[PDB]
Design a protein around this ligand. Structure first.
Ligand SMILES: CC(O)(O)NCCCCNCCCN
Ligand SMILES: [K+]
Ligand SMILES: [K+]
Ligand SMILES: [Zn+2]
Length: 638
């Protein structure tokens, strides 16, 4: 029942800085916080968040992750002059100290714990902490890489201790490895750590052998540490999404965390002098959105690095936009990950295959400039619902019921007289008026985002929805069909891609459709999730539709439909129209809940049928030449 997003920030954390010459550290500046908060303010995002004050982490809280000797050493730095601060700093790798940095480090850590408490007490759904100094390179007894104390390691240890959590996912999308987090939880199966990072075969900072893909954790932590090293610079949106679809998300949804903490370094964005990657700030809107169906949306985003002030501001805004539920921007030009990334991805999937059900089939044979991001205003009415006539339902506050116009009514009659001569059922005709009215508000107004219409006649309804969308004009339409039979849907001209979930086995011929025949049984949920993350989402993202048309025929859906409806809203700026054939109160409630941006209830835990995995890998083989985002291995060369 939680709502809102926390934003935790205090300008005191900009009141320490580098006091001597050091080209290595001169990029970590106070303005990183100032620019990020002001960017949120400029775009109206800070004003929509719940401002939670910072506090100091206590001594006892710092000792959750750090040694008494290191804390006592850092505690003396407020009393040091500049000569003494420089000599203290030289004891460590890539870090400077300042009279006020100990104070600020305790605020950065306390801010993080405030964020954890706000989310874990259900006072907000999610939130972000904008802090300095960053934390993820901090070690038990050493400052490292601009980090004094390990803010995110605190947050996980604090959440285990005070909320008795058994499963916490940490996602570190900073462009540097967070070695301090890895070390902290190396033997701990209760904390799953994922990091991608510029590595370049160990020649990039921090130059550690243990930052490679072979470090899977130790002891009973084996399999709960996932390193994805980037061995070339210039990684793009496609490389980052390939990493999510084929490594992080399959593991995350199987792990089923009770809390997600993001080590959010935006030095992984285009323009950054440390990362030298090419991902656009818009990608962070999707990295955030793809994780929101985990842990019922309980996500704590904690600022780490990010050194190009421009992409820093833009990427922070894209993240908070998604935390607030604003429509995600369309990502164009996606395709195959590059060969270096595909090598990295296939190596981590292979070493992790001992530990995760999604990868188990692999174990045996049988001046930089870029365009400014567009505005992301939320829709006035997010979701319009059309239940059968005379069905009054209690709707969430951002949902509304359907009122057919005069122009719309004339359109239905023109359509009737041209394509459905022998049709007079005055409520089929009502549904067609409803479909056209909802689509018009979705496509020709920032007024409505998405919608759900309950229908009876599937063929007429589908044909009217699709044909009307194609002349809006919606350049491309993704159709997602749960049911058997043939739809009045042509996939011959490249403007429609059809995903069909059915029960009868079918040979696919064209590469503009994906047909998934999943065995009924206790394994159906895991197979569907496997298909959704590894097949459906890669193709949908590469296809980049302008509208998503969901269709469920009246003829096992309840557990996965909410996750699909949430994740598929990463496409088409969230513009999804769902046609439900027949009235099912629970399915309609679940659909409306997911469409409106409500928290998605967790899946919990049963590994997929090997016959389903074989079916899905045959689909990947059949489709990945056309849709390269499906690839999770390096291609065979002639
Ligand atoms: C938070 C973080 O992970 O981004 N810290 C990165 C520390 C970079 C160390 N500088 C290496 C030398 C480059 N000239
Ligand atoms: K990282
Ligand atoms: K671990
Ligand atoms: Zn970094």
């Amino acid at each position: 029942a939680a709502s809102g997003s926390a934003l935790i920030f205090d300008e005191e954390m900009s009141r320490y800085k580098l006091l001597w010459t050091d080209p290595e550290c001169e990029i970590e500046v106070p303005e990183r916080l100032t620019v990020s908060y002001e960017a949120l303010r400029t775009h109206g995002l800070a004003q929509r968040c719940k401002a939670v004050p910072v506090r100091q982490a206590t001594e006892q809280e710092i000792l959750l992750a750090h040694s008494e000797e290191y804390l006592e050493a850092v505690k003396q730095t407020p009393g040091m002059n500049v000569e003494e601060l420089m000599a203290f700093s030289k004891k460590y790798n890539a870090v400077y100290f300042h009279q006020n940095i100990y104070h600020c480090a305790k605020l950065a850590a306390g801010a993080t714990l405030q964020l954890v408490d706000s989310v874990m007490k259900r006072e907000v759904r999610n939130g972000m902490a904008l802090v300095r100094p960053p934390g993820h390179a901090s070690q038990r007894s050493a400052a490292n890489g601009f980090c004094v104390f390990n803010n995110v390691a605190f947050a996980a240890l604090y959440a285990k201790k005070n909320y008795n959590l058994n499963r916490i996912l940490i996602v570190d999308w900073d462009v540097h490895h967070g070695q301090g987090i890895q070390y902290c939880f190396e033997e701990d199966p209760s904390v799953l750590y994922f990091s991608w990072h510029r590595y370049e075969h160990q020649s990039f900072w921090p130059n550690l052998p243990e930052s490679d893909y072979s470090s899977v954790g130790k002891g009973k932590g084996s399999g709960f540490n996932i390193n994805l090293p980037w061995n070339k610079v210039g990684m793009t949106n496609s490389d980052y999404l390939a990493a999510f679809f084929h490594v992080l998300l399959p593991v995350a949804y199987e792990f089923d965390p009770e809390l997600v903490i993001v080590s959010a370094g935006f030095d992984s964005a285009i323009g950054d002098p440390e990362g030298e990657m090419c991902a656009l700030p818009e990608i962070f809107a999707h990295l955030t959105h793809l994780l929101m169906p985990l842990a019922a949306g309980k996500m704590c985003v904690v600022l780490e690095g990010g050194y190009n002030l421009t992409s820093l501001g833009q990427s922070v805004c894209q993240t908070v936009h998604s935390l607030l539920g604003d429509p995600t921007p369309r990502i164009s030009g996606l395709g195959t990950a590059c060969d270096s990334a595909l090598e990295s991805i296939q190596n981590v999937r292979n070493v992790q295959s001992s530990y995760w059900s999604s990868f188990k089939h692999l174990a045996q044979s049988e001046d930089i400039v870029w365009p400014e991001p567009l505005k992301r205003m939320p829709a006035s009415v997010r979701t319009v619902v059309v239940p059968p006539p005379g069905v009054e339902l209690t709707l969430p506050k951002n949902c509304q019921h359907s009122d057919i116009s005069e122009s719309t009514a004339k359109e239905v009659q023109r359509i009737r007289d041209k394509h459905f001569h022998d049709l007079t059922d005055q409520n089929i005709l009502r549904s067609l008026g409803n479909i056209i009215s909802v689509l018009d508000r979705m496509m020709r107004s920032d007024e409505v985002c998405n919608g759900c219409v309950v229908v009876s006649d599937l063929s007429v309804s589908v044909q009217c929805a699709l044909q009307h969308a194609l002349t809006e004009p919606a350049e491309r339409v993704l159709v997602v069909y749960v049911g058997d039979g043939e739809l009045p849907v042509k996939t011959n001209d490249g403007k429609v891609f059809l995903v069909q979930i059915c029960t009868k086995e079918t040979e696919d011929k064209c590469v503009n459709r994906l047909t998934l025949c999943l065995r009924e049984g206790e394994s159906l949920t895991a197979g569907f999730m496997q298909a959704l993350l590894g097949l459906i989402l890669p193709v949908a993202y590469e296809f980049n539709p302008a509208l998503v048309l969901g269709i469920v025929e009246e003829t096992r859906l309840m557990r996965v439909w909410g996750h699909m409806t949430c994740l598929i809203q990463g496409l088409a700026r969230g513009r999804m129209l769902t046609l439900l054939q027949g009235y099912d109160k629970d399915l309609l409630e679940l659909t409306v809940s997911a469409l409106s941006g409500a928290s998605i209830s967790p899946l919990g835990p049963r590994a997929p049928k090997p016959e389903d995995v074989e079916m899905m890998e045959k689909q990947r083989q059949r489709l990945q030449e056309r849709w390269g985002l499906l690839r999770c291995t390096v291609s065979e060369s002639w």
